[PDB]
Amino acid sequence: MENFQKVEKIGEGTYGVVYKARNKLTGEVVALKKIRLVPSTAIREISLLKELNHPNIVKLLDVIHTENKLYLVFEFLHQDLKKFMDASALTGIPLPLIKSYLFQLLQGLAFCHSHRVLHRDLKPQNLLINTEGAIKLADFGLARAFGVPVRTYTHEVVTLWYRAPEILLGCKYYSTAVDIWSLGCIFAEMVTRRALFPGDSEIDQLFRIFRTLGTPDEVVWPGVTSMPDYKPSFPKWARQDFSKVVPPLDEDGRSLLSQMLHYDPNKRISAKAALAHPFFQDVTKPVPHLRL
Ligand SMILES: CS(=O)(=O)c1ccc(Nc2cc(Cl)nc3ccnn23)cc1
């Protein structure tokens, strides 16, 4: 740790405090995460992430393990998608910039998923932006290393808002499709300026999903009634049209979102396929003017 001096607090993340810090030797400015005190499988798991390098994944620079505490050192970015969404509230993010962010995050997912690494906890707070019009996913692979707790070290409630229905229904093994579901939620959120499914307990989360997308049944999702927390007594809601959910998103956009929000994870579009969707035929890379 003595190689770093703490510049400021920039978050109470899932596992510990996140600091902007400076490398007292090499001068570099980095994001420094302290991990809630570690077992050997986690060290091996984290270490494999050092190799998982992509322009849309926040680079893991180092892992520091002393007095049985754990520190991850990351590439620093100045701003997350929530702040930027708040900043953009009066007009919303321009659609060309939403499309470019979606397109880059998809490339990031397609890379990690090709290597069988999933995120499991995408949310606007771990989607970080720079002044060059780039966006990057923070904390990829950490939920498998450390688990995803109900509360953070600070007792902050972990959001359910972006959690896929299979996880909420008690599936033991979930796939890369859980990441596509969350990105789809965040897509809808950029377009509407409101969270799609802002649930405030597990059953409120499912019920909000069900209200918008129809209660899932053996027709839309073969095998669902056999899932661990599925109950035959769930209220039976009818699906709404996506024209009602995400105006004024266009037809290609609504088509893409639909396939990212399929109930059956086997049927939900992959990141790779998503990148080929007609929604991206006219994609570009705008710069946001950012206030840092
Ligand atoms: C509110 S914010 O937009 O001011 C802000 C500022 C800085 C950061 N940076 C950041 C925060 C976290 Cl948690 N992890 C990492 C990793 C690389 N940068 N970084 C995030 C959000």
Q: Both 74 and 84 in a single domain?
A: no
- 175 and 116 in a single domain? The answer is yes
Do 145 and 202 fall within a single domain?
Answer: yes
Number of domains in the chain: 2
Structure tokens at 216: 């899932």
Closest ligand 1 atom to Cα of 79: 3
- How far CA 161 is from CA of 139, 198, 252, 254, in Å, comes to 18, 5, 24, 20
Domain end among 45, 78, 111 = 78
**HEC secondary structure over the chain:** CCCEEEEEEEEECCCCEEEEEEECCCCCEEEEEEECCCCHHHHHHHHHHCCCCCCCECCEEEEEEECCEEEEEEECCCEEHHHHHHHCCCCCCCHHHHHHHHHHHHHHHHHHHHCCCCCCCCCHHHEEECCCCCEEECCCCHHHHHCCCCECCCCCECCCCCCCHHHHCCCCCCCCHHHHHHHHHHHHHHHHCCCCCCCCCHHHHHHHHHHHHCCCCCCCCCCHHHCCCCCCCCCCCCCCCHHHHCCCCCHHHHHHHHHHCCCCCCCCCCHHHHHCCHHHCCCCCCCCCCCC
CATH at 154: 1.10.510.10
Question: If you take atom 7 of ligand 1, which residue's CA is the nearest one?
Answer: 78
Task: Let me know whether 113 and 71 are in one domain.
Answer: no
Q: Which of 20, 46, 78 is the last residue of a domain?
A: 78
Residues with CB under 6 A from ligand 1: 10-11, 13, 18, 31, 58, 74-80, 83, 128, 138
Q: Examine the domain organization and report whether 64 and 157 are in the same domain.
A: no
Solved by what technique? Answer: X-ray
Cα of 31 from ligand 1 centre, angstroms: 8
Could you write out the three-class secondary structure of 78-131?
A: CEEHHHHHHHCCCCCCCHHHHHHHHHHHHHHHHHHHHCCCCCCCCCHHHEEECC
| 9 Cα to the center of ligand 1, angstroms | 9
Final residue of a domain: which of 29, 45, 78? 78
Residues 259 and 134 in one domain: yes
User: Can you give the resolution of this entry in Å?
Assistant: 2.0
For position 1, which CATH number holds? 3.30.200.20
User: Within this chain, do residues 52 and 171 fall inside the same structural domain, yes or no?
Assistant: no
Shared domain check, 83 and 48: no
Judgement on whether residues 184 and 232 belong to the same structural domain of the protein: yes
Looking at the structure, do residues 190 and 271 belong to the same domain, yes or no? yes
- 41, 165: one domain: no
Domain that holds residue 9: 1-78
Q: Indicate the top mutation candidate among 8, 10, 19, 85 to test ligand 1's pocket, ranked by most ligand atoms within 8 A of CB.
A: 10
Residues 58, 19 share a domain: yes
